[PDB]
Design a protein around this ligand. Structure first.
Ligand SMILES: C[C@@H]1CCO[C@H]2Cn3cc(C(=O)NCc4ccc(F)cc4F)c(=O)c(O)c3C(=O)N12
Ligand SMILES: C[C@@H]1CCO[C@H]2Cn3cc(C(=O)NCc4ccc(F)cc4F)c(=O)c(O)c3C(=O)N12
Ligand SMILES: [Mg+2]
Ligand SMILES: [Mg+2]
Lengths: 264, 270, 28, 52
DNA sequence: CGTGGGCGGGAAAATCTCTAGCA
DNA sequence: ACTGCTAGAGATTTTCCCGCCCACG
DNA sequence: CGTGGGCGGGAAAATCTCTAGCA
DNA sequence: ACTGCTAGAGATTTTCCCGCCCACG
């Protein structure tokens, strides 16, 4: 348990795997894996600027009727909505619906007139959503958004005989693109990828919210065969018989009788 | 037959007395007293006292229409996580509810619906849409709204937060969207301190993890357990080992999930 | 106080949040 | 590919595929699935709505 | 003169119970 | 062949902490 | 050959609970 | 200065009795 930390350290020196691999493989607590991936030099990539809130917005006018299409670009999930009239209130209503279903963090769109209303500004102020206009987050999926729109138009050309109304065939088409399109690495249709991304993001932000209070705390400690109260070290894992800390650069374990935790 | 027992019966014909009254007044055992109480066809009581169990499976969704300020609101709730969704209906009819159900099926892995016996929830359009999407339909007791009460409690909560949120927005449905956003994300508690939006992730994540791991392990591990049952010496088998215990394994022979002790067991590799 | 308490107050102004949600999201 | 004999009648490149497939099955995957399928289950019993 | 351990006083956290309302 | 259920408030039990002081190194 | 005691199987009695109704 | 309450049904626990049989006098 405690003697696998150094062989995770040399593993991160040779191959630089992330905290999940060293946590699940070596059966470690994930805090020491995040500190191993933190203490490295060349493993310090960029920040957030990954994101589960990669959302593309695109309008189209099919059969003389407005269809507003949103894409969860981090997982490739895509849906749409038939809009009767081009105004900012309809876009704000659909944006608040998307915020109600999924945690929409950032939206990417163009500088269209319908998407630049102050009603959408008040809605995103009440929501707290970063907004982008014309700027792709990364230029790989930029054409893929349009190709998915053409794919959905091919699905519409499949299922226009499956329903009478436009929006009923639209809902059947997004149901088909949610489930009836397989492939990939492990046979995921469309929902398993996005629930995997959302679950991993929820778990890593729970780890961030857990660790953001521990770094405020202090652990004054002495050792066995020692009364010299060193510290204040940083807590990693509070245990019932052994507490894990780091004083300067070493992952140490201590008895709880030798420990003293400042509450702030 | 004692004459006081027949006169107890006539007393019940005149007054419909208690069993304890006939037991005390004529020195009777309680069995014949409860028999005389059960004898009168007018002496019928208030029924039995225990509540049933509403199903908790991830493929079930509850749906109901409610009314507020002269408008109709369609609510759907996942049973295991409590993830909610609500809209304002133009008119109470089966086609718009079928469109709502098609949106729900396109956004979520829905297997089986369960509503009450309303008029809009019994349309032919809903039947055709559930046949198109392959959704098993089900309805409850026609005069018991308690099996569907789990969505009514959430309607109460929804209108309570609507009371808190009506002043911020001009229209009703904007505040309705704000309220469903608040309940799906901002309200924490329940099982493990999460909102319903996290539990609806975790339930489906366990759904598309655990049974796939089970499908991966069921082709590899195949142990044949012969068991000598209790009160007998017959070594019966083979059975499929579900999981190896420490003093008692669990197996299934044909359909019986049995906890058979390992000393009364015999595990074969193939 | 803390700035997270003030932002939890803004959360209470916008959504009327639970006590446990503000305690978990801001370590209160 | 084209010299087939032995026990199962495979060639060399197919017998090594089947042998290392059985090897990676029986090496760590059984222990990995049995050490990951321990989970946390909340539940209730009959005639009582209190979950345990 | 230099330390340890139980106690008590207080915080605080997990559970019991119990109710309002869904027409 | 079907089925009452769920969010919140004191209240009560269970449990760390700290300081301290009385008992001990 | 002449008794005792626990057991177990059944009756039966005290309590838990819980429910629906008072518009 | 005021206040939810009460009759009935399984259900479950607690407790005599009887017969009996196996253990003893
Ligand atoms: C027109 C359909 C046709 C079938 O019958 C009616 C009547 N009804 C009545 C209630 C109601 O009284 N809810 C409060 C409640 C009271 C006690 C309880 F144990 C559970 C509870 F939910 C509803 O909620 C509801 O949706 C209906 C409904 O839809 N319909
Ligand atoms: C005209 C006076 C003037 C004052 O107000 C009304 C209305 N009221 C209503 C009920 C009632 O709802 N009973 C059912 C019930 C429900 C719940 C519960 F806890 C207790 C219960 F008895 C009555 O019994 C009753 O007598 C009256 C009455 O007399 N009046
Ligand atoms: Mg209803
Ligand atoms: Mg209702």
């Amino acid at each position: 348990f405690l003697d696998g930390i150094d062989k995770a350290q040399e593993e991160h020196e040779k191959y630089h795997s992330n905290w999940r691999a060293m946590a699940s493989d070596f059966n470690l607590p994930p805090v020491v894996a995040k500190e191993i991936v933190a203490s490295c030099d060349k493993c310090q990539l960029k920040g957030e600027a990954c994101s589960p809130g990669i959302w593309q917005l695109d309008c189209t006018h099919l059969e003389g009727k407005v269809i507003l299409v949103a894409v969860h670009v981090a997982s490739g999930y895509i849906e749409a909505e038939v809009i009767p009239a081009e105004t900012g209130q309809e876009t704000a209503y659909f944006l608040l619906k998307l915020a109600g279903r999924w945690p929409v963090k950032t939206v990417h769109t163009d500088n269209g007139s319908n998407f630049t209303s102050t009603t959408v500004k008040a809605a995103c102020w009440w929501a707290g959503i970063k907004q982008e206009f014309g700027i792709p987050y990364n230029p790989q999926s930029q054409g893929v958004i349009e190709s998915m729109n053409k794919e959905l138009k091919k699905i519409i050309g499949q299922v226009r005989d499956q329903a009478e109304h436009l929006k009923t065939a639209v809902q059947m088409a997004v149901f088909i693109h949610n489930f009836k399109r397989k492939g990939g690495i492990g046979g995921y249709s469309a929902g398993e990828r996005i629930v995997d991304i959302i679950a991993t993001d929820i778990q890593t932000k729970e780890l961030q919210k857990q660790i953001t209070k521990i770094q405020n705390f202090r652990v004054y400690y002495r050792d066995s065969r020692d009364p010299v109260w060193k510290g204040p070290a940083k807590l990693l894992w509070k245990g019932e018989g052994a507490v894990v800390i780091q004083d300067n650069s070493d992952i140490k374990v201590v008895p709880r009788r030798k420990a003293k935790i400042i509450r702030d």
